[PDB]
Design a protein around this ligand. Structure first.
Ligand code: ADP
Ligand code: ALF
Ligand code: MG
Length: 737
């Protein structure tokens, strides 16, 4: 039942270059359930005939203008080679946004197309009636903002994808849309502090990665109070799981956080001498092979984050205090912890000579008591029963504790700047009804994946479980429980991999936590208990190469191999109490507030707990999903890799979405919410307290004269199609006094 053009799985140009997965060919002969003789044209290289079975042949969508179809579902033929070609043609014409049911897909162009300027914001925000432009992320922003004010219910925009897909860039674009309000008038200062925060959060939190030159090394969540006619009034920012290990070491092709390069390269000579700023090559903490990020002007961002500090109401004392801590964090890595005498195996740690001259100058930059810190890095008081002993630290421990100071100072400074931001911006009353935004670090894969990547990929798995539960599991169950539709909706879940990773027991994070709670623990003993706590699952497997320390997980985006070397050390990377209480007693105001109020606390345990707390908040809101896709690995514009596109389409469930059109209606809201959203259609039916909400909704629907097939009444909700929601919003045009 197919036309004259087919897509081919077994073709000459696809068997020769499997990365491009399909060829388009015109059928010259054949029959139903017989072999077909056809020649391919879309790769014009092969001008000769060949044969293909009846299978491995899909319809083409030959006559469509792909620039006129905004949704994948609206295409006549929605098979894999059609969806791939549909997104390709639109992407080659610089149209990257394409909707799929509630989902919206955004493909990285790797260049500013100019489609997010202020003129585009105005055209998507205030064009009368409804959105009849092309799909966009401004689609999501306006629909979510309209839903917010129409029902008084919190919404949450959630971007997703892999590293370098455009999650953060889409987030910044939606903030620019929300911040645009030419209809009303407000005080600019709070909104300007929110927008000016984006540079400093990317300076302190982002760094060059082979997968993304501006990779966010932290997750971001934002609650927003967006005005009715646009404009941002209040907000709050939360950053979780900053990767402190990046402060110490980096791969050869990567950089540390941008702020180190902005400072060393952009600081004036007076500032360099003031905070003892060395060139980047003379910092052990800075990878000297890669000092340049292709898309970033480090000197331009340096003056950008300097002006941003003023918009966030940081006094000149605090700004100078921040640069001192940044330089102090860098200089601390130059302190060599030399091995000294009076050690058991000549292993005792100490700082001497030129290292102590550097150590004193670094502590002064960090505003710390030098000799009190030095004692905590060198001597270790222990208790063999009732015997107090002033033993020494081995060189290994003293060096880790020294680097631990630099990481905690940088980690807490990043949180303190955000906390300074929230004090100036958080709403005076509180957050009851808000606009949520989630900017999570995406899936990432390297030749060597440590705990930094393990946590990041686990966050992405939990989001997908929350995606599948909300969009597929809850929706399919809700329709059946309402009596609207009994449908056999089948999909791909990640419930088994999320269990063997995050459960209370019989999971990787559980085996990690128990290993760190032991007096004597090893990375290999942690992987050992993983191999047998539960091995009856294909989601966890011992790696094929070096299986004593390496393991791999069968993720939703493929298989990823991790190595446990350093898991315990990195999972227990908390500043010691005896060192933390020294930086608390600093006479410098900002340093004294970094650890203020502090007197279980493992990263993996305190980070999964925050994820659950954030999952509970977000699920109290109505979610909107943006699926960001990276079309190539070379970051080249107009570069299209069909094999990579298809992997992300399965991972983000863009193809599996299309089932949702078969699941009845697109609008589903309780009777009371519906009567409030369209109350002016029949005020006698909506504002009558002595009425039954199902009859009142029916009276309002029958007053709207909406056709019968465009709505339905469930047991406790009113369902209606995409056509019915458009009309009711339009009918609310009557003018009351
Ligand atoms: N819509 C877009 N327009 C132009 N460039 C983009 C767009 N989305 C992503 N990019 C480019 O891709 C890079 C990575 O985007 P980013 O949002 O950091 O990815 P991630 O999803 O990892 O946060 C950015 O530096 C930017 O240059
Ligand atoms: F900056 Al990313 F995933 F690389 F959010
Ligand atoms: Mg990001």
């Amino acid at each position: 039942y197919k036309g004259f053009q087919i897509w081919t799985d077994l073709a000459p140009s696809v068997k020769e270059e499997p990365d491009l997965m399909f060829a388009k060919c015109i059928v010259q002969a054949g029959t139903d359930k017989g072999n077909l003789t056809c020649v391919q044209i879309d790769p014009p290289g092969f001008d000769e005939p060949f044969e293909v079975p009846q299978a491995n042949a899909w319809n083409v969508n030959s006559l469509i203008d792909p620039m006129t179809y905004g949704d994948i579902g609206m295409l006549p033929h929605t098979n894999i080679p059609c969806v791939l070609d549909f997104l390709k043609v639109r992407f080659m014409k610089n149209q990257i946004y394409t909707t799929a049911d509630p989902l919206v897909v955004a493909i990285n162009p790797f260049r500013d197309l100019g489609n997010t300027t202020l003129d585009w914001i105005v055209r998507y925000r205030d064009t009368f009636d409804l959105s009849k432009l092309a799909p966009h992320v401004f689609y999501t922003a306006r629909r979510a903002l309209d839903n917010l004010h129409a029902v008084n219910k919190s919404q949450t925009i959630i971007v997703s994808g892999e590293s370098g897909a455009g999650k953060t860039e889409a987030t910044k674009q939606i903030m620019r849309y929300f911040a645009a309000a030419k209809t009303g008038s407000m005080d600019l200062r709070i909104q300007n502090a929110i927008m000016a925060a984006n540079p400093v959060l990317e300076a302190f939190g982002n760094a060059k990665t082979i997968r993304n030159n501006n990779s966010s090394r932290f997750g971001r969540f934002m609650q927003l109070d967006v005005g009715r006619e646009g404009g941002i009034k209040f907000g709050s920012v939360v950053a979780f799981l900053l990767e402190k290990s990046r402060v110490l070491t980096q791969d050869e092709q990567e950089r540390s956080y941008h702020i180190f390069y902005q400072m060393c390269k952009g600081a004036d000579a007076a500032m360099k001498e003031r905070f003892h700023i060395l060139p980047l090559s003379e910092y052990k903490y800075i990878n000297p092979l890669c000092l340049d990020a292709p898309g970033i002007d480090d000197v331009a961002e340096f003056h950008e984050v300097c002006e941003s500090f003023r918009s966030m109401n940081l006094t000149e004392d605090e700004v100078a205090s921040v640069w001192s801590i940044v330089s102090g964090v860098l200089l601390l890595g130059n302190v060599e912890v030399t091995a000294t005498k009076d050690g058991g195996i000549d292993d005792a740690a100490a700082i001497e000579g030129k290292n102590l001259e550097v150590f004193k100058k670094a502590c002064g930059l960090l505003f710390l008591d030098a000799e009190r810190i030095r004692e905590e890095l060198t001597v270790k008081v222990s208790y063999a029963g009732n015997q107090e002993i002033r033993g020494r630290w081995k060189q290994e421990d003293g060096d880790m504790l020294k680097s631990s100071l630099a990481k905690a100072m940088y980690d807490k400074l990043f949180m303190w700047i955000i906390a300074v931001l929230n004090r100036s911006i958080k709403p005076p009353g509180g957050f009851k009804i808000f606009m949520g935004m989630l900017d999570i670090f995406g899936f990432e894969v390297f030749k060597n994946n440590s705990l930094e990547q393990f946590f990041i990929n686990i966050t992405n798995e939990m989001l997908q479980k929350n995606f599948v539960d909300i969009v597929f599991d809850r929706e399919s169950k809700l329709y059946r429980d309402e009596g609207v539709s009994s449908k056999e909706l089948i999909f791909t879940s990640n419930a088994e991999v999320i269990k063997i990773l995050t459960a209370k027991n019989n999971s990787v994070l559980a085996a990690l936590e128990d290993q760190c709670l032991a007096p004597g623990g090893s990375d290999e003993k942690f992987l050992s208990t993983c191999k047998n706590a539960l091995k009856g699952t294909t989601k966890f497997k011992p790696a094929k190469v070096s299986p004593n320390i390496n393991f791999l997980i069968s993720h939703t985006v493929g298989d990823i191999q991790y190595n446990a070397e350093g898991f315990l050390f990195k999972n227990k990377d908390v500043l010691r109490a005896e060192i933390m209480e020294i930086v608390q007693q600093s006479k410098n105001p900002v340093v004294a507030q970094l650890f203020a109020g502090i007197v279980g606390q493992l990263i993996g345990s305190q980070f999964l707990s925050q994820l659950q707390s954030l999952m509970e908040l977000i699920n109290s809101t109505e979610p909107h999903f943006i699926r960001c896709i990276k079309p190539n690995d070379t970051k080249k514009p107009l570069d299209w890799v069909p094999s990579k596109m298809l992997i992300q389409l399965h991972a983000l469930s863009v193809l599996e979405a299309l089932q949702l059109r078969q699941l009845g209606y697109s609008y589903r809201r309780p009777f009371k919410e519906f009567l409030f959203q369209f109350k002016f259609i029949d005020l006698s039916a909506s504002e009558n307290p002595n009425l039954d909400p199902k009859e009142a909704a029916l009276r309002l629907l029958k007053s709207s004269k909406l056709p019968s097939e465009e709505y339905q009444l469930g047991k406790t909700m009113v369902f209606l199609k995409q056509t019915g929601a458009k009309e009711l919003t339009q009918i609310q045009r009557e003018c009351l006094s």
